[PDB]
């Protein structure tokens, strides 16, 4: 589909919309538990946002093709590092603390670059759905901090611990793009009672254009001792180091898996830190039996 005007009932942001900034539209929602939506027209929005609406909010970006991130014309951008901001969450261009939030066809970036942690988006709530979005940074791009989260047909870019936190998260049909040497995932799962997983499913892992990273990228390292990550049914380019995974938390016992991957980076004969698994995991395992209630099935 093309989305070139506000869907039914949505507030409008843009040069010729009701609100000039995304922040103004978010403010306009006020305190309400009713479902709401905002349509953002083309532009670069130099804003830092906290999404804490009490109801179920959907944010839609303008695009000629909703099925991909490649035609997005809405960018939310801000630049600050976590040391300067005072925390990881405070460094985030977008901070999602609203259950049931969905975002479609929006790019989010932190422009800090290499040298310190600088979050593009933090997801810190349950039933978060992201469709056709881009998330760009270098160190700590996507803070999947907590809660059940689903990313479909998104582009996640960075170099160092750029998908990190303790969310239970499913990445489906995403392009995961390294722009520097480092580990892609850094899960902070830390207790046996934690039922969470990262599942990277039918994704494409590759270098950013113009950057040479052959064997310089790791699938992950353990931010805490019980990090659990599976890459399944995915394409892994020659960026993946033969060891596959690397170290971080002392005394870590990560649960790291691969199942039915392909590509130049998928040979498992020299891997370290892995566990055997005989089948791919499903979304019921990662997101709970109720995933069908909140995931948008058109992706």
Ligand X SMILES: CC(=O)N[C@@H]1[C@@H](O)[C@H](O)[C@@H](CO)O[C@H]1O
- Give the residue among 48, 32, 187 at the shortest CA–CA distance from 111: 48
**Residue 193: CB partners within 8 Å, gap ≥ 6?**
none
Q: Nearer to ligand X by C-beta: 143 or 150?
A: 150
Q: How far is the CB of 101 from ligand X (least distance, A)?
A: 9
Residue 100, interface with ligand X (CB under 6 A)? yes
Active site residue 250: no
Question: Is residue 170 a contact point for ligand X (CB under 6 A)?
Answer: no
Check residue 263 for interaction with ligand X (CB under 6 A).
no
Report the helix count and the strand count for the chain, using DSSP H and E: 4, 25
CB of 299 to ligand X, least distance (A): 15
**For ligand X, the closer CB: 56 or 247:** 56
What is the SS3 assignment for 39-98?
A: EECCEEEECCEEECCCCCEEEEECECCCCCCCCCCEEEEECCCHHHHCCCHHHCCEEECC
Sketch the per residue contact string, 111 through 130, with ligand X: x for CB under 6 A, - otherwise: ----------------x---
DSSP annotation of 208: P
**DSSP β-bridge partners for residue 138:** none
Site for ligand X (CB under 6 A): which residue of 1, 16, 289, 293?
A: 293
Q: What is the Cα Rg of the chain in Å?
A: 18
Cα angle, residue 41 at apex, residues 147 and 81 outer, rounded to 5°: 50
Contact track, ligand X, 138-157, x by CB under 6 A: --------------------
CB of 137 to ligand X, least distance (A): 27
Among 126, 140, 161, 166, the one annotated catalytic: 161
Beta carbons of 92 and 122 less than 8 angstroms apart: yes
* Residue 294 binds ligand X, judged by CB under 6 A: yes
How many Å apart are CA 160 and CA 185, to the nearest integer?
A: 8
Q: Could you tell me the smallest distance in angstroms from the CB atom of residue 189 to ligand X?
A: 23
Dihedral angle, C-alpha 27, 29, 35, 38, nearest 10 °: -60
Nearer to ligand X (CB atom), residue 56 or residue 202 = 56
Give, as ranges, the residues between 35 and 94 that touch ligand X (CB under 6 A): 35, 56
Minimum CB separation of residue 100 from ligand X in Å reads 3
Active-site positions? 161
> What residue ranges bind ligand X (CB under 6 A)?
35, 56, 100, 127, 293-294
């Amino acid at each position: 589909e093309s989305r070139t005007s506000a869907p039914s009932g949505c507030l409008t942001v843009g040069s010729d919309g009701t609100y000039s900034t995304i922040g103004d539209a978010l403010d306009a929602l006020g305190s309400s538990t009713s479902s709401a939506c905002i349509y953002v027209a083309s532009g670069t929005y130099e804003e830092q946002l906290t999404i804490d609406y009490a109801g179920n909010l959907t944010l839609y970006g303008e695009t000629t093709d909703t099925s991909t991130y490649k035609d997005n014309v809405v960018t939310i951008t801000h630049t600050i590092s976590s040391p300067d901001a005072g925390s990881l969450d405070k460094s985030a261009t977008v901070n999602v603390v609203s259950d049931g939030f969905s975002m479609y066809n929006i790019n989010v970036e932190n422009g800090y670059g290499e040298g310190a942690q600088a979050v593009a988006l933090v997801g810190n709530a349950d039933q978060l759905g992201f469709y056709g979005c881009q998330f760009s940074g270098y160190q700590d791009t996507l803070y999947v901090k907590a809660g059940t989260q689903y990313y479909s047909n998104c582009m996640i870019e960075g170099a160092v611990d750029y998908i990190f936190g303790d969310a239970s998260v499913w990445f489906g049909e995403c392009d995961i793009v390294s722009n520097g040497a480092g580990a892609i995932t850094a899960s902070s799962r830390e207790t046996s009672s934690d039922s969470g997983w990262y599942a990277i499913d039918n994704c494409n892992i590759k270098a950013a254009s113009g950057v040479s990273l052959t064997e310089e990228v790791y699938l992950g390292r353990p931010w805490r001792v019980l990090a659990r990550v599976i890459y399944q049914n995915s394409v892994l380019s020659d960026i993946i180091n033969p060891k596959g995974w690397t170290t971080m938390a002392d005394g870590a016992t990560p649960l790291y898996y691969e199942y039915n991957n392909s590509g130049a980076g998928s040979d498992t004969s020299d891997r370290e830190y892995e566990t055997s698994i005989s089948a791919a995991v499903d979304k019921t395992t990662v997101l709970g039996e109720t995933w069908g209630d909140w995931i948008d099935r058109s992706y």
